[PDB]
Every structure is written in C-alpha cells, then in structure tokens.
Design brief:
Layout: H1 10-23, H2 34-42, H3 48-58, H4 70-78, H5 88-93, H6 105-115, H7 121-130, H8 141-150
Helix pairs in contact: 1-2, 1-4
Bound molecules: calcium ion (2 copies).
GO molecular function: calcium ion binding
Keywords: Motor protein, Myosin, Repeat
Domain EF-hand: 10-45, 83-118
Length: 156
C-alpha cells in the first residue's frame, strides 16, 4: 500500500530483474543460496562474504523462506558508490552531489571546501608533482592517491 512515494526506478527495476532471474523457478520462496546465485552468475562481488556482510548487517538470516529478497533490494544500495570507494570523495559528495570521484578544477575546489582542508596553491602545487598534472587538470582516482598517500598538514 504505497502512499505518494516517487523513489528511483532504475534501481527498483534492477532488483526485480535479478530477482525473477533466479526466482524464475516460481517456487514462491527464497533461500540463502539463491541470493548468491545472481552475484555468482554475473560476478558482482568477489566472495559471498560481501553480500553476506551487508545482508547479515540488516538483522538476521536463516535457511530459506522468501524475505531473502531483501538481499537484492539492499544490494542495489550497498553496491552503489560511497565513501567505501574513496575518503576524499566522501567530503565532496557532502556538498557536490554530482561528485563522481572525479571533477574539474572548478568543482575540485568547490566541493573541497566541504572536506575542510582548504586546497590552496599548495595542494595543487604538489598535485603537479606526483600526479604530474597542472592546476587546470581535472582530478581522478590517481589524484586522491597522491594526496591520501602524501599525508601532510600544517594547522595544528
Ligand atoms: Ca526462487
Ligand atoms: Ca562532479
């Protein structure tokens, strides 16, 4: 019984796809093995530990019933991009929603303000040292690497 809830469709649909994929049997029930069948077919995660981690965190589990479907419903979320991928991206995402782990020079210092690091001529100065890219160059995974790896500061 819905109650005026738009919500995303791209993900909501994905779950149904993978769900009916293995549930095609039409048994009406779901086991702990079926939930992994999907990820095992496409190879989403490396080991069941991943899916089991999030799922287990949900609450509890058993042998087989039907509620197992939650695995997919949450999978679409747990699988989504988050701080888990990058630390810096986390601070940016807080302000710049468009943040996708990489942005130009404009958005770079734009979302940076969120991280509370104050990326000045210094930050960029070194960026061209390790990353080997000028200030007029968008940042990427490699960028966060040379940064997180650098490990510097001067505020305390
Ligand atoms: Ca089934
Ligand atoms: Ca962006």
């Amino acid at each position: 019984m819905s109650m005026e809830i738009e919500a995303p469709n791209a993900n909501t649909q994905k779950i149904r796809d993978c769900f009916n994929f293995y549930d095609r049997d039409y048994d009406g029930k779901i086991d702990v093995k079926q939930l992994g069948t999907l990820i095992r077919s496409l190879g989403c995660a490396p080991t069941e530990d991943e899916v089991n981690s999030y799922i287990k965190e949900f609450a509890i589990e058993g042998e087989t019933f039907q509620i197992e479907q939650f695995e997919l419903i949450m999978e679409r979320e747990q699988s989504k991009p988050d701080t888990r991928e990058i630390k810096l991206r986390k601070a940016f995402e807080v302000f710049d929603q468009d943040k996708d782990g990489k942005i130009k020079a404009s958005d770079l210092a734009h979302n940076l303000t969120t991280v509370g690091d104050k990326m000045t001529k210094e930050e960029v100065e070194k960026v061209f040292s390790i990353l080997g890219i000028t200030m007029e160059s968008d940042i990427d995974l490699a960028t966060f690497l040379k940064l997180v790896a650098l490990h510097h500061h001067h505020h305390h």
